């Protein structure tokens, strides 16, 4: 429901840095940056949105001067802001549906500073470093004008064009596929029944081990993992007493199955 | 204090079937030293030509990477995903459970 850009500046040593810029729409990725050519790489045909061919170049130039100036203030202020090698810097910025605009920064995995309204504000827990860092970021007022212009105006008018052009790819439906298998036994005289599911899109699913119409409540539903093609994966396990298990089944409900649940029946041989 | 150990998850896109091509996915999530050696192993040897996704982070600024490769499993071949990292005394090896 939100589109955000991330920036990952990793300073492994004094002469070793790697900054990665990527544009994401919630879970899937839609843009990438290439400092080798200093251009924005569109990952999908629709990923250009409803924006002009010209102002896209105006954005990629604004980005390249912003990423090059930013990625070099650090190691000039490394001693200044007491940054300890090695260290990491992370930034997230974007907007949501319908229209809150956010921008946050992280130093060494923790919340360091944030941008609110038209200024940089330190997190109270972050200490005095953030105040110093906020002051150096608050120095040049043109940048914070440019930043606030992006977050308030460009982000909503872009995400509207992006979601519209991605409608065929956002609400596309891919049917799942399931297979049962054996898992690591949870103890003595106990088996583990595993029900893998893969290939479904979107993420919303329903998976549970069954006994007729009685949902076996001891069903352990795992995390939803990607598969590098836009689909997902999920394994659900269940522990039984080496018996009274040959009558168990795994039922799958998804928005792509059109109301016909996938059902698989355990054999055990 | 701010050193997080990655979560390693191994899975296959399709059901295992000897002779048919498939995809093997290893998923490292939940770490913030942010520099790590993810390697897929086929019968012990390092698998080459392993493609990944572009690195990113989650809400708690914790890093996750997806590494995948295509392969044809056999009956005598066993595979694993080996991870080397700051927060690891020895490389952590996670095997692929095939029934």
């Amino acid at each position, epitope marked *: 429901l939100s589109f955000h850009v991330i920036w990952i500046a990793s300073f*492994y*040593n*004094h*002469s*070793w840095k790697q900054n990665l810029v990527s544009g994401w729409l919630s879970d899937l990725q839609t843009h990438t940056w290439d400092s080798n050519s200093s251009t924005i790489v569109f990952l999908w045909p629709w990923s250009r949105g409803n924006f002009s061919n010209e102002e896209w170049k105006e954005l990629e130039t604004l980005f390249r001067i912003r990423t090059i100036r930013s990625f*070099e203030g650090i*190691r*000039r202020y*490394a*001693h200044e802001l007491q940054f300890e090698y090695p260290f990491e810097i992370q930034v997230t910025g974007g907007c949501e549906l319908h229209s809150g605009s956010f921008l946050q920064l992280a130093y060494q995995g923790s919340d360091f500073v944030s941008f609110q309204n038209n200024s940089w504000l330190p997190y109270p827990v972050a200490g005095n470093m953030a105040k110093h860092f906020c002051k150096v970021l608050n120095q040049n007022q043109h940048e914070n004008d440019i930043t606030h212009n992006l977050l308030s105006d460009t982000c909503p008018r872009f995400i509207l064009g992006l979601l519209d052009a991605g409608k065929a790819h956002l609400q596309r439906q891919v049917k799942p596929e399931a297979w049962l298998s054996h898992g690591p036994s949870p103890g003595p005289g106990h088996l583990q029944l595993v029900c893998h599911v893969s290939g479904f899109y979107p993420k919303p699913v329903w998976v549970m081990w069954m006994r007729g119409e009685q949902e076996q409540q001891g069903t352990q539903r795992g995390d939803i993992l990607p598969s590098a093609d836009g689909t997902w994966y999920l394994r659900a396990t269940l522990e039984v007493a080496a018996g009274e298990a040959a009558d168990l089944s795994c039922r799958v409900k998804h928005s792509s199955l059109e109301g016909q649940d996938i059902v698989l029946y355990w054999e055990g041989s | 204090g701010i050193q997080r150990t990655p979560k390693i998850q191994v899975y296959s896109r399709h059901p295992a079937e000897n002779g048919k091509s498939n995809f093997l996915n290893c998923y490292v999530s939940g770490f913030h030293p942010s*520099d790590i*050696e993810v390697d897929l192993l086929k019968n012990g040897e390092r698998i080459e030509k392993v493609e990944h996704s572009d690195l990113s982070f989650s809400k708690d600024w914790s890093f996750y990477l997806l590494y995948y490769t295509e392969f044809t499993p056999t009956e005598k071949d066993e595979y694993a995903c080996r991870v*080397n*990292h*700051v927060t*690891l005394s020895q*490389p952590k090896i996670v095997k692929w459970d095939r029934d």
Partner: T-cell receptor
Amino acid sequence: KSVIRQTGSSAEITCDLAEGSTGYIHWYLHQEGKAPQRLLYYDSYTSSVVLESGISPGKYDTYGSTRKNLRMILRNLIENDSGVYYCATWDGDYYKKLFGSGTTLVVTE
Amino acid sequence: AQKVTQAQSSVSMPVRKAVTLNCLYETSWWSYYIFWYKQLPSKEMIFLIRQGSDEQNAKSGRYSVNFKKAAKSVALTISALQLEDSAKYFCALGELRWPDKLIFGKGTRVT
């Protein structure tokens, strides 16, 4: 190879490297009895001169715009910062860090 | 977060013999080389041998290394001793993935 200077003045050390297999170049200081440490490194691709740890900024500068003829100037000398000064750069393979000749610098009141 | 030191400061061995120089390192890295260098009395510095991490035992010509990665120790074993190779020696260490500065020992003078 040998430079003598008084306290408070300036000094420029010119170091030599075998042709140029040069990317980033590092400067090391060697004192007998102690251990050699790096003071600063020069990135020619952006003229970046960043110090290291608790080294006073501005005390050391480098501008040699040549692979083999490269200079480092250290200013406001004291009786302490006297010793051998090396220039080093890594190989193309990054397997071996090749060092220069070394200039002996002595400082007296 | 690394440290490298050497114990002995000055030693002497018979000509045409075998001698060693130990080095201790406390490192928090999983990929790194450690090298040995030769400081001539004329301040010239020369590379000798490169090893580290899981890279077997390096014997790149008339000189080997005793590698104890579990105990974090490396010893430069120089056999077929030459009277000519009588100088100072320094123990260095650096990162593998991101090669940068080296951390040296206090030196081992050889006569």
